[model samples]
Target: GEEFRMEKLNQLWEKAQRLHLPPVRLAELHADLKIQERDELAWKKLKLDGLDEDGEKEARLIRNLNVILAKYGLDGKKDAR
Candidate 1:
């Protein structure tokens, strides 16, 4: 399922390049994904409303990104660049 968007992995990888982006971009992506992760989780508790298997798989990507950011010591506390 890693290739959920198999045909467009290149397209999505381009988005990953944003990890090297300015703090503001990183912050914004982080915020959006964070919100998405949380929103999905809120539904994860329910039965049929929970995110699909793909959504669950996509879930790890956001968390991994956040970890990568923090691993380099990006400060969430700082104003977005």
Candidate 2:
């Protein structure tokens, strides 16, 4: 179940990247979710921000970094078994 959850998270992370969301924004989103109640509103804002014509390319680059981190199993676990 834990692995499955992680896998799903990776998928969402990828989706966010494909849509061109920035890494800093992505990190902020993740942190927000962890530290506070889920902010669906903020997520929408970030998504829209990333999708803008001028922001899209940078967002994609950031998301690509996110995908790479996930593929390497370095998303959050410090000691992956």
Candidate 3:
């Protein structure tokens, strides 16, 4: 699962490259859940600003990231095995 997510993330990173969008970074989704769980108020305060906009598309993208994390039981900080 880790290998799979890494591959998907690599594809996305390359996409950002092909699109010429820089500094497009990834944030983990316990931190991910916080933004989504808030459901409002998470925005483009960074990625070097102005060019970044947070919305359902981005939200949904990472939300799927979180879903994958959850599927692998990786969505939290607690030790799970």
Candidate 4:
């Protein structure tokens, strides 16, 4: 699961680096990306503790990130689920 997430994150970050976005929006994306990283760690911890059955936060974060990607024509891959 971590590898899958990391692969998606790698593609997203690669796109962010290449895209010519305005400073304000670029900062927004980076901010969300950081949140993704934090949420990912939290999710992992919860899973390790056998308490992350729902994965609501992780799923919500992915949706948010994908929406941002879509707006910029950086489409995400098919869901890994």
lDDT values, one for every candidate: 0.45, 0.47, 0.42, 0.65
How close is every model to the real structure, measured as TM-score?
Answer: 0.35, 0.30, 0.31, 0.62
Tell me how candidate 4 scores on lDDT: 0.65
- Residues 27-55, candidate 1: write the lDDT tens digits: 55455445544543554454255455566
Candidate 3: tens digits of C-alpha lDDT, residues 1-81: 131234444443343345443342333423443444333223333323553454544566566655645533443333654
Q: List the residue pairs that clash in candidate 4.
A: none
- C-alpha RMSD of each candidate structure in angstroms: 10.3, 11.3, 13.3, 6.4
Ten residues in sequence with the least summed lDDT for candidate 3? 39-48
Clash-forming residue pairs, model 1: none
Superior candidate under TM-score, 3 versus 4: 4
Rate residue 57 of model 4 by lDDT.
60
lDDT of 4 by residue, 6-66 (tens): 5655566567666777777667766676676667677778778877678776676677677
Candidate 4 local Cα displacement, residue 16, angstroms: 1.3
TM-score, predicted candidate 2 vs. hidden true structure:
0.30
Q: Model 2, 1-81: lDDT tens per residue?
A: 121124444465555456566788567545533322222334436566764556554455346545444544345443745
lDDT at 80 for candidate 3? 50
TM-score rank order: 4, 1, 3, 2
Question: Which regions of candidate 4 deviate over 4 angstroms?
Answer: 1-10, 77-81
